Design a protein around this ligand. Structure first.
Ligand code: WX9
Ligand code: NA
Ligand code: ZN
Ligand code: ZN
Length: 384
C-alpha cells in the first residue's frame, strides 16, 4: 500500500533525485557517459514529472492524479530507488570509486532501473497525460492474456501476475520464477505494468511458446549479452574478428523491446542489425543458414533453435539471477519477500513457506536441514 502521490510527495522525489545527481557528479567515479547515464535520466525524469504536473493543473485534476494506482506505485518506487542510491553511496564509501566493486555494480543496476522507469512513465503518460487504460500491447495474443486476467489494469503485483501466467505457461520451479521476475519486472518494484509486459512479450514472441523462447534465447544461450553496451559488444567481438560469423545479441536500454545483433563480417568488420517485429530465434536461424550468425560469442557450437518452431538446471537459473535484484524475495515460492531468519544456519525465507515446511514434518531447515534452534523476523534489501 502507498500513500497518495500528491504534489508535496512528487517534490520529495525531485529533491532525492537531485542528491543522487550530485553524488554521481563526483569525478572520482570515472563514470562512463554510455547508457544508462544517470546524469541524463534523472533530469529527464524530473522534466517528465513537470510535464505531468502541467497537464493536471487544478485541484480536481491533482486529486485524480494523486489517486491513480500506477502513479502512486511509480512515485513510491521512484522515492525508494532514489533513497537506495543515496544509501549505496553512504555505505559504499571508497568502494564507489572501484569500477569492479559490488557497490558500483549496484549503481549500474539502479541506473538500468531508473532508465526503464523513465521509458515506462513516458509510455503510460505520453505528453504528461495518463493513457494506461488505453495502452496498446503490441502482440494481440499477449494482449488477450493481459485482458483476460487483469482486465484494463495498467499494473498488477508480481504475485498475481506469476500465478496467472502459470495457468497458461507453466513455470517449473522457484528459481525459474525468480529468473522470470528479474526479466519482466525491469523497474524492480514487485509489480508488472502493462508496459513491462509489452516489452517482455515483444522480445520473447511468439506468445504461444514465450517461456521456451525466453529459456532458450536468454537463460541458456551463449550469444545472449543482456544490456551489454554497443561498445562492449564490439570490444567483446573484436577478439573474434578473424572468425567471420561470430555473433552476440543484446538488449538496448534506449530501444526497449528490441534486440541488437552484433556480428563479424567476411572482411573482419563488426557490424550490427536490429531485427523487425519478428521472433529473434527466426532471425538467428535465417542468419545461420545465410552464414552471418554461426559462432555465438566466438563459440564453435551454435545451439539448434529450430525446435522452437514446434531441461534448464537450477544452477543455470542461479547464475542468470546474479545481474538482477531478487535477493530480498523468498527462493522457495518466489512471490513473498524474505521476512524470517533461521538460527543458527542463517537461511532466509518467507514465514508462509517456513510454516508450510514445519507443518510437513520437514527435518530442520528447508535449505540445509540443520536443526531450527530458533527464528527471528528480518527485512531484506536486494543488495544484501
Ligand atoms: C550492462 C549489463 C551487462 C554487463 N555485462 N553483461 C554481460 C551485461 N548489465 C549489468 C548489470 C549489472 F549487474 F549491474 F552489472 C545488470 C544487468 C541486468 C539487470 C537486471 C536485469 C537484467 C536482465 C538479465 N539478463 N541476464 C540476466 N538478467 C538478470 C536483462 C533483463 C531483461 C533481465 C540484466 C545488465 O544487463
Ligand atoms: Na515492475
Ligand atoms: Zn516463500
Ligand atoms: Zn539452513
Amino acid at each position: 500500500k502507498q500513500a497518495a502521490a500528491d504534489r508535496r510527495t512528487v517534490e520529495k522525489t525531485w529533491k532525492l533525485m537531485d542528491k543522487v545527481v550530485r553524488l554521481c557528479q563526483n569525478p572520482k567515479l570515472q563514470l562512463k557517459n554510455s547508457p544508462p547515464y544517470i546524469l541524463d535520466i534523472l533530469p529527464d525524469t524530473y522534466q517528465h514529472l513537470r510535464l505531468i504536473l502541467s497537464k493536471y493543473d487544478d485541484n480536481q485534476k491533482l486529486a485524480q492524479l494523486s489517486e491513480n494506482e500506477y502513479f502512486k506505485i511509480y512515485i513510491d518506487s521512484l522515492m525508494k530507488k532514489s533513497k537506495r542510491a543515496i544509501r549505496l553511496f553512504k555505505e559504499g564509501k571508497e568502494r564507489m570509486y572501484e569500477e569492479q566493486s559490488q557497490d558500483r555494480r549496484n549503481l549500474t543496476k539502479l541506473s538500468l532501473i531508473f532508465s526503464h522507469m523513465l521509458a515506462e512513465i513516458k509510455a503510460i503518460f505520453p505528453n504528461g497525460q495518463f493513457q494506461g487504460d488505453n495502452f496498446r500491447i503490441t502482440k494481440a495474443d499477449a494482449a488477450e492474456f493481459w485482458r483476460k486476467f487483469f482486465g484494463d489494469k495498467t499494473i498488477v503485483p508480481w504475485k498475481v501476475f506469476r500465478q496467472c501466467l502459470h495457468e497458461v505457461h507453466q513455470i517449473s520451479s522457484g528459481l525459474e520464477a525468480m529468473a522470470l521476475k528479474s526479466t519482466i519486472d525491469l523497474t524492480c518494484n514487485d509489480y508488472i505494468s502493462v508496459f513491462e509486459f509489452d516489452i517482455f512479450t515483444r522480445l520473447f514472441q511468439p506468445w504461444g511458446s514465450i517461456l521456451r523462447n525466453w529459456n532458450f534465447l536468454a537463460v541458456t544461450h551463449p550469444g545472449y549479452m543482456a544490456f551489454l553496451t554497443y561498445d562492449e559488444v564490439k570490444a567483446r567481438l573484436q577478439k573474434y574478428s578473424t572468425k567471420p560469423g561470430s555473433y552476440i545479441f543484446r538488449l538496448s536500454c534506449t530501444r526497449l523491446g528490441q534486440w541488437a545483433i552484433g556480428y563479424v563480417t567476411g572482411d573482419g568488420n563488426i557490424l550490427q542489425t536490429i531485427p523487425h517485429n519478428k521472433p529473434l530465434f527466426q532471425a538467428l536461424i535465417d542468419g545461420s543458414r545465410e552464414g552471418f550468425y554461426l559462432y555465438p560469442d566466438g563459440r564453435s557450437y551454435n545451439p539448434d533453435l529450430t525446435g522452437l518452431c514446434e531441461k534448464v538446471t537450477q544452477e543455470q537459473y542461479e547464475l542468470y539471477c546474479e545481474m538482477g535484484s531478487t535477493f530480498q524475495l523468498c527462493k522457495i515460492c518466489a512471490e513473498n519477500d524474505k521476512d524470517v531468519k533461521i538460527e543458527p544456519c542463517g537461511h532466509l525465507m518467507c514465514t508462509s513457506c517456513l510454516t508450510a515446511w514445519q507443518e510437513s514434518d520437514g527435518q530442520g531447515c528447508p535449505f540445509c536441514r540443520c536443526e531450527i534452534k530458533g527464528t527471528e523476523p528480518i527485512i531484506v534489501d536486494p543488495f544484501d
